Structures are given as C-alpha cells and as structure tokens.
C-alpha cells in the first residue's frame, strides 16, 4: 500500500506527472500536488476531490496547471503547462481521507 | 471544543458539547448543554430548550428547562456539562436531554436541506404559552450519527439457477462483507455457470440505494449510485468467472435530485446518505428514513443480489 | 438574521 | 488566504516544544507534518490534537486561540527533521516555512 | 464618569461624559461622545435634537473628512478606552435656544440624542438597533449682580398722592432662598387701607408659533397690615418659592426632567446680548408683585441656581 | 450660622423634638434628623425637605414619629443622641449640624 | 423597551 | 436597603486610607464624615471625590466601582469617621472606623 509518482524541459514547455498508488483506491481520497523549491517550504498547488469529482487551484498555478484523476488504474496526472521560471521544485503527489490531514505520500 | 450560539438580543447563549451524537444500537445519545440568561435583568423568570427531530413536520419533540432550577428536573451534570457551568459560574444552569430510540440519524435529500433535522432550540418566555420571540432565541443543528459494527458481519452471498434448457443457468454472488466503508473499493467476485443452449450478452454490474420513509404512509423509492456494464457473453454450455469493481460517489448523480445524503449542517455537500441500522430483531417502527444498498448484478437474456451497508467507519 | 455559531474550549 | 509562521528557524533527549500561529480563525483545522531530508513528508497530528497512527507518542498536538503548538516530548536521535503545520479549512491551504533541528 | 447606555441589539453603545450641560450665555458647550458587522450597512448616526414638535435636529456620524471636528478632551480618552470600534463625534450646539425645562405633569421642551445604525437617513430606523439618550443643557446665575431693583409709583388720587415705594436684595437670586422685600410706603392720603399684598409670579414665555405667555403665583404672604391715612409704614416682609405648595397648579413651569421626577421649579434663563431675539422654547422669570389694596409694585428678579462646583 | 435643637420619658412615654438654625433658611435645608447610641453608629431616623412636602422615615420607627418644619422661626420638629440636620437643596451630604 | 443608563469611568 | 459595610474597624502625620462597600450600584452618591464623640459630624467629601470647603487637603475621596475609599494622605485625626450611601432612599450610614 504504498505511492509513487514519475514522468526537465524548456520553459514554456510542458511534463505529465504520473501519480500512482497501489494496495488502495482513488475514490477514498482526494488528490494534490505540492510544491517543494530546494531549501524552502511546501505550497498546495492543485487537488482533485476525486468522490466529490470537483478540483481546486492555487493562485501561484492558476489556470495554467490542471489536474485529472485515472480511475481505470488507481492514477491521477497533472497537466503542467508553460512553465515559469519559478516551478523548478521537487514535485510530490498526494492522497487524503473527512481530511485526517494529507496522510498519504510518494517518494 | 463546544459550539456556541447566542440570540439576537445577545443575553441569551445556549451550549452544546458536540453537534454529531452516536448511537450505540442499544441506545442514542442524549444531548448535554447551557443555557445562559442575564438573571439580573431577567424578570421573565424561566428559560426552556426544546430538542425536535424535523423532517423538512417535527416528529419527535421534548421541552427541558434549566432555570429557574426545577427540582423535579434533575437529572446527574454529564463531565462535560459540569466543565461547562463551573467554568461559567452562578449566572449559568445545566440542561441534558434522553433521546428515544427509534428515531433516526440526520440523512437528507439531495437537492434548508429538506429531511429529517435535529434542530436544538432555546428561548426565553415566562411559560410555554407566549410565542417565541426572533430576539430572544437561538437555534442549533445537530446530528444524530451511526457507524459500522466493529465486529465484521460475516460473510453474504446469494444464488439462483434461472432455468428456461433442462441443464442449467446458475449464478453465485460473493463479497467480502455487508458493511462497507465509503469509498472503499467493492471487489464484485461473482461466478456462473451456464449449461444452457442460449448465449448472453452483457452482465450489468451497478449498486441500488433503497431509500424508506414513514411520514404519510410507508414510501420507498431507490437511486442507482455506482455502475459498470461488461459486454463480458458467457455461450451456452459454458461457465465463466470475473472478479468486478466497484465504488459509488456523488459526482455522477449531482443531476439526480432525491438521493440521500447524510445531513447538511447549513448547505454542505458531505458524502451520500449511510445506511442506517434497525433495532432488534423485529422491524420495529422507527421514524423518518431508512435508507439500503443491494448490489445488483443481472445477465442481459438472449438476477443476483446482495444485500450490504456501505456506512462510515465508527471514527477514532 | 446574523447570528454566528463560534466555539469556545473549557 | 490565511498566512501561518512560526519561530524558531533552526536549533541545535531533551524535549522539544514549537508554536505556530495564524492570520484568521481556522479553528482546530491544523495538521503537522515532518520530513527527513528529500523525502515525501509524513503526517504526525490532525485536528491539532489527534495523534495518527504509528506516530511515537512523543508527538502531541496542542491549541491555544489561533496559536497552535507541537510537543515532542523529547529528541530522540531520529527526530531530526523538517516540519510544517498547516491550516486546512481554506483553499489555498497554506504551510509554513517550518522548523529544521539538529 | 461617562454615562453609556447600550442598545437591545447588544451592539451599540453611546457615550456622553455629561448631560447636565452648561452655557456661558456667549456660547453654549458642544456635545461630546463615543458612537457595522451586525449592521453591514456599515454606517452609524449620531442625532441632535431639541423637542417641544423637534425645534432643531443635527446629524452626523463618527463612522465610517468633513466631519472632523478636533477630538476634544475627555472623548479622546474615551477613544483610547475603548479601542478600534470607538470613534468619535461632537456638536456645535446653537446658541438662540432654551434650556431644558418642563411643565408640572414630561412635557416641555426635551433635548433628545439617538445613536442608530443605517446606510442612510432615508432609511428608517430600527428599535432593535439604537440608543436614546436624554439631556440637560442648563444655565447658572451671573456672577456680577444686577441693579438693587427698586421700583416706585405715587399712585395719584388725596392731593398728596399715596406713595408705594419698594426694593429688594438682588435681582439674581439662589433658589429654595427667601427675598427679603423691603418696602416703604407714605401714606399721607386722607383714607385708609388695610392689606398689602406681596407675591411672586412665574412668567413662561413659549413660541411656536406665536409668542405666548402663561403666569401663576409660586409664592405668596398675606399681611393686613392696615396703614393708617397721613402714616407712613415700615417693614421688611418674606416670601419664598417652593413647588410642595402648588402641586395641584397644572402646567407650572418645572426644572428639567429626565423621564420623572420633582426637579424643582422652572429655572428663570438668560436672554443674549442686548438684541432681544425671539428665542424659540420657553422662557421664564420672575418679579416680586406687592400690591397694596384698593380702599402696585413689581420688582424683577432672575431666579436660578449657583454655578455647580 | 449655628443649628441648634431642644425638647428622659418612661417606655410608653412621648416628646416634642425641635431644632432652630440661624443665619440661614428652612427651605435651604432637607431636615434629617439622626440619631446615636452611646459608642455606636449613627441612624438616620426621618426627614423632612417641605419644599416637596415629603416626609421621609426609617424602617426602625415607621408611623411611631412624626416630623414637621416650623417655617416661621426656621425651626423643625430608642435612647440615644438626636441630632437635627440639614441638606442641599443638590444633596452633596450633610452639611450643617445641630447641637 | 428595557434599556439602562448605566456608567462608566475611563 | 443598601447594606453598605465599612472597614477597616481601627487602626494606629502619617498616610491613611477607609475603605466601604455598596451592595448595590450607587452611583456617586457617597459621603464622609468626622465626628469627635461628643460632637456633631462635619462633612468632609461629597460625590466621593469633592473637598467641600475648609476641609484639610488631606481629604482626597477616592472610588473604584462600587468600592468608595478615603485617603487622608497625612493624620486631631484620630476621630470617627463614617462613609454614607444616598442614592436610593433611605440613606445607611456605616459602623465607622476610628483612628488612633
């Protein structure tokens, strides 16, 4: 029971995310992604409510990004696009739950 | 951590410890609180809480006093209640209610939410007589909840051999258990086993939410909350297994008015309705809504059931 | 019209 | 949004106790966090209070108003680590800029 | 000491550190005091009136350019009391305006202050969200004494006419005090007389709509001291005012009342300058009528209260 | 200015209090008069500010006593001390005293 | 219908 | 009935301070007054702050809430002295404190 997300490039260019979970399945949680710049805090970026099937947005990713959940295997990807010079980080995906907090983490 | 609402004459408080009660089968529990007056410009002289179940027509309703302090209305401070009035002092007095049994959780409608509500009202008046005045009230929501039973109800399952063919057309449906935790992934491990000369084209694997009230008489009505159709043809003379999967949400029913929810507290959007449990063994006359799932799982000609309790997991 | 339902911890 | 910091930046058995506050009424809707270096986090608290599961008791959530505080009642040798806490009642969720140890 | 009251909503609060408020007959002293997320509307009011009919309302409001009238004194210490919610307000009161004073049952004239919440003064206001306050502005006898306010007649029959001759302590005089009238006829007439009459009298003067004055006694001593014809008589008489005698006299100007109450009788109040303007309210004094029988004399006398320490 | 007062009976018995000022005037004056048991307190019994024609008694003798102001000689009218007493007319305590 | 003038020192 | 109490009972230039209590609001209306025994009172305070005239000015009224107080920053002081109470009628007069 356990997750992992995969998948450089020129700014303005775009990478797919790939967040994969396995033991449990998507419905129970929503899913995020979280920023990490080297040597500084983390920041909610974007999140699918996958049993509520609505998603939300931070304002540093607006518009730009955008999130969709892969029931069909357990999978959710993020649909970065026009990468700023600010959005090199240490990606994470994420699972939660009523959110006990974001309990769940990739690698 | 205890809610507080005060009127809008802003002298009157009234306290609850929690807005979510269990029930624990056997028993519900009763609501705690306080209810704060100023006595010094308190002429009226008394103060009532009144706890109604209303399914938006009240059912079930009680009318509780805690000042002037009635004698005859003792009843024992809960811990919580007597943290409450020893941290508020003299000028405050404990209330606490019995909730009968029979009487249901909060679930609601999917559209005030309309259903069954729980609607903890205190005010002020010399006697029950006089009506209630906006300024000199407040009104709380609550729940009544219920969760699953920790003991794992052993295992269900069904069977039918729907003869047309002298050999048969026979199925078996098999699931981990009948009580469910929402979200959870339904693994579907059906079989069956077709000797028959006649061929099948799709097995319809989908989820019913059986929902029963009594307000004018006994109604029923149901709403298909999770899917899957399988072209999956089984040909005469052959057997077949697949282990299937399921889960049901709120998303692809958005547009479906009716289906239950678990109460809205003021207009949330919390998961779907929980099924509820009966008391004892008879099917005894419990109040407002009932509300079941059955998995259905039928082969299109050329039906399996079972019953389960997807119901929220008793929380830590 | 205004009433508010804001907790408060013993 | 709602902005949440904490104090100190960084300090070198002995037990530990750390505070962080924020900008609107959240209520006890707080997390904590903790991560060891390049890894995906972990979550210690929810609720502010609730100390989940595996967690080392030492871990204990606290409140008081909309400052909300972490106890470990001691540094083992393996608590050295980032941590965050974090409101979510409100989209954006905000962490903070946390606390490194050593 | 500040006086507050606060609304039935809870919300609002009022503060005025006095309503006993006095005048320097040059000026009268502005009102001070303390006046959104209950009233969303965000905007408070202040209102200013003088009731009778309203003679003069004033608006303003301390929340949330035009208005800012210095703060004075006291009102920034309130301000500092109370913190972020607390704004001030004040009013330049007219001056060509009464003082309060009543009728013996409160009618009258009354100075009403109501603090409300609204958007606008087109909108009505609501009970369940204001603060009414009642008020006193009062006046205090001048320092500098008038004239000894003597008056004569040789009223005419007799070719030696009879003489009334009269004086009196002071024309200012402290309330609750008696006059020590001082009176010296001669009566070198050919007939006697057997009563002299001393008596005072509240003139009211009231205007709304025309100029309007209502008079009774508010003290009175009967003395038949006949004076013999070619005599000339001597002695100093004593009146006295006070109200326990002339309840049953309805309408008998009265002091300012709050809601109810046996405040004293109605304060005589000063005119300004020398311009004579007709002010509107009530305005009242007294003289001091001897009258000897028929077989008279008025002395006037300002009636007020000491200046309050 | 002085405030001076006059008028031993058996229980059962009756007498006639009164108290004269001078230099000054009755209506000037709430008349209280109070009294005090020898190395006790002090009780207000009664009082009288006839410019309201009010009579004003303690709890302790109500009815029994009876007071009265005689206007013409600036003058008014259990063992203990009894003092005559006068007031404002506003009350700011008491402030002239008999004998 | 039942307000009160109370006081206040600063 | 106002059951305004008084303390201290006693005690022995030298600063001083009397303190009363009001079982119920009174607004200012409080007095004090120093009688030698054998001697009718004379008023000191008015309004539980106002010197009245010819008093020493060691007579400062002094009040908090419903607690009304005397200071005679400096003690013929070791007299009798009595706070009041006024607003409502009828009037309390309190047991006295000497001073010695």
Redesign the interface.
């Known amino acids: 029971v356990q997750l992992v997300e995969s998948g450089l490039v020129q700014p303005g260019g775009s990478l797919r995310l790939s967040c994969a979970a396995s033991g449990f399945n998507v419905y129970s949680s929503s899913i995020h992604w979280v920023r990490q710049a080297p040597g500084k805090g983390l920041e909610w970026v974007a999140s699918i409510s996958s049993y509520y099937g609505y998603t939300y947005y931070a304002d540093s990713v607006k518009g730009r990004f955008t999130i969709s959940a892969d029931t069909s295997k357990n999978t959710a990807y993020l649909q970065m696009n026009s990468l700023r010079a600010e959005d090199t980080a240490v990606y994470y995906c994420a699972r939660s739950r009523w959110y006990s907090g974001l309990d769940y983490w990739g690698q | ?11 009157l408080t009234v ?1 609850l410890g929690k807005r979510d009660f269990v029930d624990h089968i056997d028993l519900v529990d009763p609501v705690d609180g306080v209810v704060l007056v100023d006595p010094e ?1 308190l002429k009226e002289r008394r103060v009532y809480v009144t706890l109604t179940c209303a399914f938006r027509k009240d059912l079930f309703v009680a009318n509780v006093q805690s000042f002037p302090p009635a004698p005859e209305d003792k009843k024992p401070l809960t811990r ?1 209640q007597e ?2 009035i020893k ?1 508020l002092g003299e000028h405050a007095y404990p209330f606490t209610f019995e909730i009968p049994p029979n009487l249901p959780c909060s679930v609601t409608l999917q559209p005030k939410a309309c259903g069954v509500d729980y609607e903890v009202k205190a005010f002020c008046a010399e006697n029950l007589e006089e009506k209630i005045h906006k ?1 000199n009230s ?3 929501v609550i729940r009544k909840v219920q969760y699953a039973p920790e003991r794992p109800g052993p295992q269900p399952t069904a069977e039918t051999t729907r003869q047309f063919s002298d050999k048969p057309l026979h199925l078996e449906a098999s699931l981990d258990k009948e009580i469910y ?5 339904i693994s579907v491990n059906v079989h069956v086993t077709n000797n028959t000369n006649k061929t099948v084209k799709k097995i319809k694997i989908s989820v019913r939410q059986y929902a029963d009230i009594c307000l004018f008489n006994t109604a029923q009505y149901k709403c298909p909350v999770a899917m899957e159709e399988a072209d999956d043809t089984v040909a005469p003379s052959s057997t077949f297994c697949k282990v299937y999967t399921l ?1 049901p ?4 029913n ?1 547009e479906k008015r009716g289906l239950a929810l678990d109460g809205k507290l003021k207009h949330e ?1 919390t ?1 779907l309705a929980s099924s509820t449990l009966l008391r004892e063994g008879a099917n005894r006359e419990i109040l407002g809504i009932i509300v079941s799932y059955k998995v259905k799982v039928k082969l299109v000609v050329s039906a399996v059931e079972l019953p389960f309790t997807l119901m929220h997991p008793k ?2 | 019209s205004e009433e508010l339902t804001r907790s408060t911890h013993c | 949004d709602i902005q949440m910091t904490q104090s100190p930046s960084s300090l070198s058995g002995d037990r530990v106790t750390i505070t962080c506050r924020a900008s609107q009424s959240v209520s006890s809707a707080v997390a904590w966090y903790q991560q060891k270096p390049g890894k995906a986090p972990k979550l210690l608290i929810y609720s502010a209070s609730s100390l989940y599961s595996g967690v080392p008791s030492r871990f204990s959530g606290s409140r008081s108003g909309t400052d909300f505080t972490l106890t470990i009642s001691s540094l083992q040798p393996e608590d050295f680590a980032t941590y965050y806490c974090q409101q979510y009642k409100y989209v954006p969720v905000t962490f903070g800029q946390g606390t490194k140890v050593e």
Do not use: C, I, Q, W
């Open positions: 951590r205890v809610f507080k609402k005060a009127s809008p004459n802003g002298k306290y410009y919580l943290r409450l941290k300024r407040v009104r709380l935790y929402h979200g959870e992934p889960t949400f709120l998303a692809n958005r959007d998961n929380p830590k």
